[PDB]
Short mmCIF file of C-alpha atoms and ligand atoms in Angstrom, two decimals:
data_model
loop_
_atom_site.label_atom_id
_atom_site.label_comp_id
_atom_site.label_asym_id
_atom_site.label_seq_id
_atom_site.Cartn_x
_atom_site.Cartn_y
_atom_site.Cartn_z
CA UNK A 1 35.75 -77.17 31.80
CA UNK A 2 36.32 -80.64 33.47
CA UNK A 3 38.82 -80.57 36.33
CA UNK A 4 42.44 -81.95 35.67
CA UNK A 5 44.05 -83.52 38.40
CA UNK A 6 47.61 -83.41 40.12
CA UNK A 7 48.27 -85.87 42.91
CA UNK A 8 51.02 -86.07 45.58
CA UNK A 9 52.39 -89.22 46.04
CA UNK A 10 54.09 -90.30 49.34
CA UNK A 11 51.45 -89.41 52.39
CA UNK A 12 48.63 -88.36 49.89
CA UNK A 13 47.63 -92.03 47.90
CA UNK A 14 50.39 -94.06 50.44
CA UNK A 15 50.91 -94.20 53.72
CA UNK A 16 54.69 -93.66 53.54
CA UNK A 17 55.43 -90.34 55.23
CA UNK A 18 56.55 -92.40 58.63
CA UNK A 19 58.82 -94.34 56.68
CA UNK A 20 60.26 -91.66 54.91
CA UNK A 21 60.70 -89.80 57.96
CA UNK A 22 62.73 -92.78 59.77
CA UNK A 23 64.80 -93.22 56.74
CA UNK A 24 65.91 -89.76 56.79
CA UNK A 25 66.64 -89.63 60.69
CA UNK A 26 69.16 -93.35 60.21
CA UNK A 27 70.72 -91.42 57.46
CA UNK A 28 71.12 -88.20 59.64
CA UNK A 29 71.82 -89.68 62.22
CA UNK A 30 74.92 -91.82 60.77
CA UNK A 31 75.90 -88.35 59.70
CA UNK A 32 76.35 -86.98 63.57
CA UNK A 33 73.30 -84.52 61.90
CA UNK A 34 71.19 -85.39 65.44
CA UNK A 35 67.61 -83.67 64.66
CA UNK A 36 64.38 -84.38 66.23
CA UNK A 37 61.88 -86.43 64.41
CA UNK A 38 59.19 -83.67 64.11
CA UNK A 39 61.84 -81.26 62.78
CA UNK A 40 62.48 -83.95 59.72
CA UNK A 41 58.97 -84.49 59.49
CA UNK A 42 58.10 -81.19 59.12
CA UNK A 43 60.39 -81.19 55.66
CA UNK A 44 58.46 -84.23 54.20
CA UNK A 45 57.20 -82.72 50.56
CA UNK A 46 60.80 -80.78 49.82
CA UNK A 47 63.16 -82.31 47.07
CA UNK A 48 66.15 -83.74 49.26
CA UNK A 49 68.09 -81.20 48.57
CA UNK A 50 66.05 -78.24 49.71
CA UNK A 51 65.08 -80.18 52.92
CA UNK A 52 69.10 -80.63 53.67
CA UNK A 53 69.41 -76.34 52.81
CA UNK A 54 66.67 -75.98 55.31
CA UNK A 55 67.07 -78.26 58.35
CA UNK A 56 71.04 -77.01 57.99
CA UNK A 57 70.60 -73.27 57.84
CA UNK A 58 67.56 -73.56 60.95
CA UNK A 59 70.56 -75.58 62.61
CA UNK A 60 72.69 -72.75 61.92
CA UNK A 61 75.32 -74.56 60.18
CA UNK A 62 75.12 -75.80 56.40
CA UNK A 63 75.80 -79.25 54.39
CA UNK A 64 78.40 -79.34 51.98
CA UNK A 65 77.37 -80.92 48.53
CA UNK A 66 79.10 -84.16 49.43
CA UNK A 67 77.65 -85.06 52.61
CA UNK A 68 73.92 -84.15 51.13
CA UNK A 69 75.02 -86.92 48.33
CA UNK A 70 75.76 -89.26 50.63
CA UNK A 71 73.28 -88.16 53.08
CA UNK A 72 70.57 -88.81 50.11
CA UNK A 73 72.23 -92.07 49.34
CA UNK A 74 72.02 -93.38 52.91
CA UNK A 75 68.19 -92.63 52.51
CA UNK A 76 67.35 -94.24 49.62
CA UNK A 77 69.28 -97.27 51.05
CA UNK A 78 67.50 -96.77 54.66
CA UNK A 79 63.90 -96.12 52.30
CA UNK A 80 64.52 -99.36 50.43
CA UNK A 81 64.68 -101.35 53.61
CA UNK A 82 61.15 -100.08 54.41
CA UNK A 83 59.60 -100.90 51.25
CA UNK A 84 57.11 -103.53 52.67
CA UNK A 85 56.15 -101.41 55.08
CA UNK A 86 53.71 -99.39 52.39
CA UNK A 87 49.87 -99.22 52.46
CA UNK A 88 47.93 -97.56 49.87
CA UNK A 89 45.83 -95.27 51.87
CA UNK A 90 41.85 -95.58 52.09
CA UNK A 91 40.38 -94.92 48.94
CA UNK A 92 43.56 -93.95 46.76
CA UNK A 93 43.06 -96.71 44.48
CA UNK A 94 39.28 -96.12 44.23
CA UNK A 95 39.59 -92.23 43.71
CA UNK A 96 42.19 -92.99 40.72
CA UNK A 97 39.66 -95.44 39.16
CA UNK A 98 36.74 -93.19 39.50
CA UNK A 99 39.09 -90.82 37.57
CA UNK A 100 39.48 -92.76 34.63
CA UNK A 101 36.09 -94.07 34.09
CA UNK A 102 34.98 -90.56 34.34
CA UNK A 103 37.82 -89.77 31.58
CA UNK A 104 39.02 -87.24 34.10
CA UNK A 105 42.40 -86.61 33.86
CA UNK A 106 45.25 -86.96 36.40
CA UNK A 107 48.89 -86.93 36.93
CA UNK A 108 51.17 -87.65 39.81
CA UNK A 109 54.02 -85.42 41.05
CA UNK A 110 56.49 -86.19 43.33
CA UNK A 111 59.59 -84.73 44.99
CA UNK A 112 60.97 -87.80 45.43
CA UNK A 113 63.66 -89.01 42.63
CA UNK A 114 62.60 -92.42 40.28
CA UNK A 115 63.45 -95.02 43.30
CA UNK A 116 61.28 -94.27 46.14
CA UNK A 117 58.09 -93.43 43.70
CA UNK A 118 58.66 -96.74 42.17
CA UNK A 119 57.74 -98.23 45.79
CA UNK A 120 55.56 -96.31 46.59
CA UNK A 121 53.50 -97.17 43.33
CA UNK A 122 53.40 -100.95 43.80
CA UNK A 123 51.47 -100.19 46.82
CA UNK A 124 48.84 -98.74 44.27
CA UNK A 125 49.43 -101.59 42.39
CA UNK A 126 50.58 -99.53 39.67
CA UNK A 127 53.65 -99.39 36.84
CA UNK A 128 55.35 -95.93 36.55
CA UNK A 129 55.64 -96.36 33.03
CA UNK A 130 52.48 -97.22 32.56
CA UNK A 131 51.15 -93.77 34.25
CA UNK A 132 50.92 -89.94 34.01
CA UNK A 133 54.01 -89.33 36.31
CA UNK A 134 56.77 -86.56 37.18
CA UNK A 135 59.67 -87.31 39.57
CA UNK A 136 62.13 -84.80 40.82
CA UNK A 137 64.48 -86.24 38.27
CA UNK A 138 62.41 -84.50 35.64
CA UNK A 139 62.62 -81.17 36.78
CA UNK A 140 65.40 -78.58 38.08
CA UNK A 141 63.42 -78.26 41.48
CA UNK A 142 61.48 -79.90 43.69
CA UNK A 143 58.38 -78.00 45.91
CA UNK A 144 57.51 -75.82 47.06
CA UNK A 145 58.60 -74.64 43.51
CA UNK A 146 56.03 -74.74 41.03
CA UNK A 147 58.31 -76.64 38.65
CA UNK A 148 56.25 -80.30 39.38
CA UNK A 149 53.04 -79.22 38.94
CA UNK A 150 53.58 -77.51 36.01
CA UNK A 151 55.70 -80.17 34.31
CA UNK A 152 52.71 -82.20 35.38
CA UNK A 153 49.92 -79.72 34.47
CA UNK A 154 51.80 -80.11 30.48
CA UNK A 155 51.80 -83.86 30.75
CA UNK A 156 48.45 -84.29 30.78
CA UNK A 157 47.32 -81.46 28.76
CA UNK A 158 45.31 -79.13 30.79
CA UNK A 159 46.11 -75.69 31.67
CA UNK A 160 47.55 -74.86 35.59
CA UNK A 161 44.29 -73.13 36.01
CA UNK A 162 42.15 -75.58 35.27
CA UNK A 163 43.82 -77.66 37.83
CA UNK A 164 43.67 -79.29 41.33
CA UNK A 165 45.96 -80.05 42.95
CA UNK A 166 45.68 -82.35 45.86
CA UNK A 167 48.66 -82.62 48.80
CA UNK A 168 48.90 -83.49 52.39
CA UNK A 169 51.82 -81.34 53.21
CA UNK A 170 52.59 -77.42 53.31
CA UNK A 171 54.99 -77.74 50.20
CA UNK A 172 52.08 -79.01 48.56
CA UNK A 173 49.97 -76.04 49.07
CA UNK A 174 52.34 -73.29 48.65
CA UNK A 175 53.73 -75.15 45.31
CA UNK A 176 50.16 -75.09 43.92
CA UNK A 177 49.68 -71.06 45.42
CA UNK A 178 53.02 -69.98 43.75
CA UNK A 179 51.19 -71.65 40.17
CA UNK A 180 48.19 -70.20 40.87
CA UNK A 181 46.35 -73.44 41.19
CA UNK A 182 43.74 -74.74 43.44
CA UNK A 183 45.08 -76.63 45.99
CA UNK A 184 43.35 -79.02 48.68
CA UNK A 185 45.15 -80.82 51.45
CA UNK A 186 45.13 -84.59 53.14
CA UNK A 187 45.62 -85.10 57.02
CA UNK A 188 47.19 -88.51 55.75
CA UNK A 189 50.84 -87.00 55.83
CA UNK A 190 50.52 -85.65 59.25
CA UNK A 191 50.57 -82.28 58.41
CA UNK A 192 47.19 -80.26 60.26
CA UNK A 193 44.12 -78.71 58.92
CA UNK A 194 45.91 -75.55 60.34
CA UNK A 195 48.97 -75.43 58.69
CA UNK A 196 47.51 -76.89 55.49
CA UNK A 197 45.10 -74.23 55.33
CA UNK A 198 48.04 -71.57 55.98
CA UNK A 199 49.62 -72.66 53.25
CA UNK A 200 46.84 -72.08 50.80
CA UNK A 201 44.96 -75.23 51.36
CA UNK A 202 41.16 -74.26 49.86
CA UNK A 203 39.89 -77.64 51.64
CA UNK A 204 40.89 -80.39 53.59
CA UNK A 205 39.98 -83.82 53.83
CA UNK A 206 41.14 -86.82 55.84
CA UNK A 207 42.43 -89.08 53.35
CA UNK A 208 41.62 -89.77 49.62
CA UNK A 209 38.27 -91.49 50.68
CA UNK A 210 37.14 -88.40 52.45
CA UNK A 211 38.04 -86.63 49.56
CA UNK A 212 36.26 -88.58 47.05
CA UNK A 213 33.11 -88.56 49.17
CA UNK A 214 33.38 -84.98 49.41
CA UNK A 215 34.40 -84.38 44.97
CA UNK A 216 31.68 -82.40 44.41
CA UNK A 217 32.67 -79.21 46.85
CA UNK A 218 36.09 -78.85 45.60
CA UNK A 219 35.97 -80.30 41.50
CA UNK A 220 33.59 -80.60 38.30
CA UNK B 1 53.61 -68.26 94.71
CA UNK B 2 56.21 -70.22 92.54
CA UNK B 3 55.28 -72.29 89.69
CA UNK B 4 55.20 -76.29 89.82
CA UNK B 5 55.70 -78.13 86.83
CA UNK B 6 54.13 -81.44 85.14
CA UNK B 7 55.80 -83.00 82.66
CA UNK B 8 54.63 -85.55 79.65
CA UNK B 9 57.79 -87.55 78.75
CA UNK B 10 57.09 -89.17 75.45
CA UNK B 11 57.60 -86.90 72.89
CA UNK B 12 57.75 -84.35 75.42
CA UNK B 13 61.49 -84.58 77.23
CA UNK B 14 62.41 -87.88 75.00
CA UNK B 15 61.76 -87.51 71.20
CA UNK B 16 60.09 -91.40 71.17
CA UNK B 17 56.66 -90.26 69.94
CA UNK B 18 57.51 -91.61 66.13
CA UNK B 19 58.64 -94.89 68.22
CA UNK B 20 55.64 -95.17 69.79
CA UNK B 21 53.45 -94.94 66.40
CA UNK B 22 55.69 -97.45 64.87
CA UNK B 23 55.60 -99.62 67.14
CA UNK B 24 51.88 -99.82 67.69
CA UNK B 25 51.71 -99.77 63.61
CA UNK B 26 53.61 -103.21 64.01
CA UNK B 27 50.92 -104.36 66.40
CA UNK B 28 47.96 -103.62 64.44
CA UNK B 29 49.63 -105.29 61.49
CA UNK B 30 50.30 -108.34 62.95
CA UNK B 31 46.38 -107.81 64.38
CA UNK B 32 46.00 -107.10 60.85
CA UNK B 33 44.33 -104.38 61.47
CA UNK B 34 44.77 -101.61 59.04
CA UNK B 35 45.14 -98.13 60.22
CA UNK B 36 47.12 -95.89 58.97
CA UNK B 37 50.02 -94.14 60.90
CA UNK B 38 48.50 -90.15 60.97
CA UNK B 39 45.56 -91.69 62.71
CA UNK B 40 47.75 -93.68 65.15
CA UNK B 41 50.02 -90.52 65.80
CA UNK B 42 46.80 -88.15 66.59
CA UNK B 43 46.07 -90.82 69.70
CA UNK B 44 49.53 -91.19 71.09
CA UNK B 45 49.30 -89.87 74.71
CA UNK B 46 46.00 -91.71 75.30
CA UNK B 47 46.06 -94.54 77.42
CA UNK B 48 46.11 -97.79 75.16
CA UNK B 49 42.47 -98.62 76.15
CA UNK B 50 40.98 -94.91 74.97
CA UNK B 51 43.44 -95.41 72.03
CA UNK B 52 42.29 -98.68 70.87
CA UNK B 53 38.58 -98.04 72.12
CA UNK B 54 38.97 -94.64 70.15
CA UNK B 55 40.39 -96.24 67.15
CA UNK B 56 37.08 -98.86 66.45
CA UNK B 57 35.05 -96.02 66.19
CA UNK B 58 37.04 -94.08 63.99
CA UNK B 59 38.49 -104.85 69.29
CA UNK B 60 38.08 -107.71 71.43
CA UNK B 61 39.67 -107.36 75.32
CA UNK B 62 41.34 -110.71 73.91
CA UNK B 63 42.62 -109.13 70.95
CA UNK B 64 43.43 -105.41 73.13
CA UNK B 65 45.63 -107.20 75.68
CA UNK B 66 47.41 -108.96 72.57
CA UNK B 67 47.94 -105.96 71.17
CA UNK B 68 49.08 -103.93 74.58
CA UNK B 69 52.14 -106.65 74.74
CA UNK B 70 53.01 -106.69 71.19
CA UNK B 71 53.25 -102.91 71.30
CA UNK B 72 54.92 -102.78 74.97
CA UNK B 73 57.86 -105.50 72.57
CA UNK B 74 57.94 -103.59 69.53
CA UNK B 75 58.56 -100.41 71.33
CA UNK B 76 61.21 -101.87 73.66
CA UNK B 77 63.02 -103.34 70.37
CA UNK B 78 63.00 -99.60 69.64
CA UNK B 79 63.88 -98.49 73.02
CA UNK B 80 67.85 -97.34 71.36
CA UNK B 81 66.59 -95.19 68.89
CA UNK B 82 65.35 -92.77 71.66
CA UNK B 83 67.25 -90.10 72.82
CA UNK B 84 66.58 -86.89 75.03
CA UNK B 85 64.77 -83.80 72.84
CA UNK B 86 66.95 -80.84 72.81
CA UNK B 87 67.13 -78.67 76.14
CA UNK B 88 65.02 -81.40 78.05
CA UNK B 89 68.28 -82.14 80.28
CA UNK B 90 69.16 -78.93 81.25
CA UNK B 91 65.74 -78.19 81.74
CA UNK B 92 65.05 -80.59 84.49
CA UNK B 93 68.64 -79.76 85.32
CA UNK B 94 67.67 -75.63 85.89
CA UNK B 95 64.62 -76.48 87.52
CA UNK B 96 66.44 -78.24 90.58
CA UNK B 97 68.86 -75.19 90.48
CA UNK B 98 66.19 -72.97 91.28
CA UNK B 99 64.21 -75.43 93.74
CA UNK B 100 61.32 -75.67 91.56
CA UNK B 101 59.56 -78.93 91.90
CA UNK B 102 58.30 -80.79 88.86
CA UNK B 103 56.94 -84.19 88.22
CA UNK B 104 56.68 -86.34 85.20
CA UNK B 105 53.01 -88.17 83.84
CA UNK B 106 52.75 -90.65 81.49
CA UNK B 107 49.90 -92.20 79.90
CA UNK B 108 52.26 -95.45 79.51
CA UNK B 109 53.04 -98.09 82.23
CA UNK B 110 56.60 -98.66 83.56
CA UNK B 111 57.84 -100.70 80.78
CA UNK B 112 57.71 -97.72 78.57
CA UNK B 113 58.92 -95.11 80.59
CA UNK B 114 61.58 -96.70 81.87
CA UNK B 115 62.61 -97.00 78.26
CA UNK B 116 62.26 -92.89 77.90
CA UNK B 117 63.82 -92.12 81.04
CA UNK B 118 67.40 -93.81 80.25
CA UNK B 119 67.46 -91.19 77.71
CA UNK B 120 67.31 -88.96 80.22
CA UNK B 121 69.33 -90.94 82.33
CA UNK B 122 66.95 -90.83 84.83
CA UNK B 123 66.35 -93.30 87.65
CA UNK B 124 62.47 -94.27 88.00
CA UNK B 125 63.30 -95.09 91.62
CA UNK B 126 64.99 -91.87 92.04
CA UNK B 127 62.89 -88.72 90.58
CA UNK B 128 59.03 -87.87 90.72
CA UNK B 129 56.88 -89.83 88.59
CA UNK B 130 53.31 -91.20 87.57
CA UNK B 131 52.62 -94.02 85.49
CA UNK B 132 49.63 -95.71 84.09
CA UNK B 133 50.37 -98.28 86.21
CA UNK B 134 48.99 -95.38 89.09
CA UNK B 135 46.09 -94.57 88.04
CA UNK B 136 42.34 -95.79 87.04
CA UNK B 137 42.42 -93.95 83.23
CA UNK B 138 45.01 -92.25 81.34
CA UNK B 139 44.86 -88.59 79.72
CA UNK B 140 42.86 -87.07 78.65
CA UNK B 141 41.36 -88.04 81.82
CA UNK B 142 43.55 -85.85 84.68
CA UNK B 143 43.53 -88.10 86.91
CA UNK B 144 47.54 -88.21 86.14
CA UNK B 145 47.88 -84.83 86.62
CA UNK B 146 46.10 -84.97 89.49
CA UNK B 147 48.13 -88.01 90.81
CA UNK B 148 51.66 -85.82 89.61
CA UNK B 149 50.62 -82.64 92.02
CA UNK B 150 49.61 -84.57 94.70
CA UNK B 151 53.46 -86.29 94.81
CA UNK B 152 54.80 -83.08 94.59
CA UNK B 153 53.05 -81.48 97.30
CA UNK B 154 51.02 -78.77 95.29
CA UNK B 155 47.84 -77.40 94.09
CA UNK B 156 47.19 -78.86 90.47
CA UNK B 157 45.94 -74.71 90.62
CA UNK B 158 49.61 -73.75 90.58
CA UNK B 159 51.03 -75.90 88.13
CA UNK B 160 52.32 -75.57 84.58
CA UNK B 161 51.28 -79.05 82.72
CA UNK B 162 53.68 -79.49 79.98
CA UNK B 163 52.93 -81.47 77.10
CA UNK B 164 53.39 -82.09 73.71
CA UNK B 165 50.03 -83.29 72.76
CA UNK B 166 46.13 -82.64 72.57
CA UNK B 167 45.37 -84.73 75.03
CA UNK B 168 48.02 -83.40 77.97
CA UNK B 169 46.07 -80.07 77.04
CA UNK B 170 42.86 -81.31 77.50
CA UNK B 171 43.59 -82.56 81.15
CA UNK B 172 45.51 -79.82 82.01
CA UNK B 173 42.37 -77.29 81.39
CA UNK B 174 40.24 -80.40 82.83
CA UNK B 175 41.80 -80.28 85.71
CA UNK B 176 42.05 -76.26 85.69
CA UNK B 177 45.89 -76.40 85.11
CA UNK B 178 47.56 -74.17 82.83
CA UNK B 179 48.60 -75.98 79.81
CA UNK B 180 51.55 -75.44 77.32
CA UNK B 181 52.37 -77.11 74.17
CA UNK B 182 55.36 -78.58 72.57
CA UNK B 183 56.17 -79.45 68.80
CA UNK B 184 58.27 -81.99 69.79
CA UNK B 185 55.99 -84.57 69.30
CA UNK B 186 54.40 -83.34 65.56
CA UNK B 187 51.11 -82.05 66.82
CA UNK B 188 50.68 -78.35 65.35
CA UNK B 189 50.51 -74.63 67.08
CA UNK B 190 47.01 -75.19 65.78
CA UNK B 191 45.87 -78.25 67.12
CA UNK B 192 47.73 -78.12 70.77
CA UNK B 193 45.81 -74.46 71.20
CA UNK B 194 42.50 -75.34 70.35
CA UNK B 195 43.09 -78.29 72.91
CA UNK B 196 44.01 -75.53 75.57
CA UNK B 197 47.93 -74.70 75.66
CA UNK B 198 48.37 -71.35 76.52
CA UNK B 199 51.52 -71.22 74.92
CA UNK B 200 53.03 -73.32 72.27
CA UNK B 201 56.79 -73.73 72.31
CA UNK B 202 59.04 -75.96 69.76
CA UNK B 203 60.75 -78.05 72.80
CA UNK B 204 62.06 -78.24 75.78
CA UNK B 205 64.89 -76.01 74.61
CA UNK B 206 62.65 -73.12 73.45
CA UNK B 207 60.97 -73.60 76.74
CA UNK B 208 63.61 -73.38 79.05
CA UNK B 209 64.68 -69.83 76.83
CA UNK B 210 61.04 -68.36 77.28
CA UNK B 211 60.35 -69.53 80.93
CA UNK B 212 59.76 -66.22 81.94
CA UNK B 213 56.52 -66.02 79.60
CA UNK B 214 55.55 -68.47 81.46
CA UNK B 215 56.75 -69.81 84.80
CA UNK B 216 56.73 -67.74 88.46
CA1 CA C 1 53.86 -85.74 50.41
CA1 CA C 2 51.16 -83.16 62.76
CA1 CA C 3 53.31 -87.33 74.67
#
């Protein structure tokens, strides 16, 4: 039973994690919403809308459904502006091409809505219509629910179980726990081996080269 | 015996750590030198010559004092996005209430922490302080820690080194200081423990409301 396989997008294949942090602190900040970078950073991997639930209720406070619109709109514009900034990570491109010529089959899942993983896929030098892809705009929620993976798992055919999925953030992990799937976590979001692991992380590797020099251990 | 305190500033009392990867990101770029930004984060707190000298492994003197003053202008182009981490003010602020002493160490020159310390508005000229600019090597040698107790008059056996990364933790148990950690500047509970820190707190805030854990 060849292993099926469910990618992250934004800290996991490119190295856009910083940027997405410092477009969500502009767009907080313009919103008198003053919160520490690490706080923000900690979210990376949540659908926008569950980050905004979270960093308001451990503010004590709450976000109306207007401001998070806005707030998510100020973002995108703030992400835009960054666009040039993003590097595929080491060995993203060549794990995704050993993939294919070894007809194993992958998708990529995403929190983020159609416009930042558009920019985040030129890095890879790839065309989202032209890959196995689900956005937050195809599902009802974004991780740590399992709806991605799953939507993703169905896209390419293979059962959740015969999955890996493969993360570099806590929402990653527990997303892929709450499915039941195997789940391995990246350093190249930030996140530690610590919390990774916490979260339900079975191994972690640096970045997508360390993973691919490492396949074997965690995928057949 | 009451407690003396050390402080880290960036990404310890100012929340400038993400400036500080940024802006050496912007550097190595222009270097083009690719690296990318988690590996740059884990280093900040290092002096830039351990950084960069660290990073090969994982550069020219030409090209490392090119990149020193390209970083030292991309952070100070960055220097308004900085402002004090939560609890940091009153902090400092309690401290001089109760006539503790503290002093701050930084593995960056004066350039840079002047830059954190308006955030603070702090005077350089005016507080206790130790720069890069001080000292022969930055942390995780101690020799800033060392430098910090000395201006304050106290036995680097009786103070509290507070920092937010791995490498304030390693000189503060180098050194035989007691070490403890802050979030503040996205290292995890994990990592900052392993390095040493006794305790691991989210910021200065969380601190300041658990001093007792941890201060005389
Ligand atoms: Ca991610
Ligand atoms: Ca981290
Ligand atoms: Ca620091």
């Amino acid at each position: 039973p060849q292993t099926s396989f469910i990618f992250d997008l934004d800290g996991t294949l490119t190295d856009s994690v910083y940027q997405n942090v410092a477009a969500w602190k502009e767009a907080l900040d313009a919103e008198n919403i003053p919160l520490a970078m690490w706080r923000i950073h900690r979210k990376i991997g949540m659908s926008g809308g569950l980050m905004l639930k979270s960093l308001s209720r451990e503010t004590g406070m709450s976000i109306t459904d207007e401001q998070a619109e806005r707030l998510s709109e100020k973002h995108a514009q703030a992400y835009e502006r960054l666009q040039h900034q993003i590097i595929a990570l080491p060995g993203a491109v060549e794990l995704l091409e050993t993939l294919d010529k070894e007809n194993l089959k992958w998708c990529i899942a995403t929190s983020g809505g159609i416009d930042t993983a558009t920019i985040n896929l030129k890095a890879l030098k790839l065309d989202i219509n032209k890959i196995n892809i689900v956005t937050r705009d195809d599902v009802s929620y974004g991780k740590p629910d399992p709806d991605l993976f799953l939507a993703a798992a169905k896209k390419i055919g293979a059962p959740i179980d015969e999955c890996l999925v493969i993360g570099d953030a806590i929402w990653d992990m527990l997303a892929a726990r709450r499915c039941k799937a195997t789940g391995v976590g990246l350093l190249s979001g930030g996140y530690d081996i610590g919390e990774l692991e916490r979260a339900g992380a079975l191994r972690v590797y640096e970045d997508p080269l360390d993973l691919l020099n490492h396949l074997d251990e965690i995928a057949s």
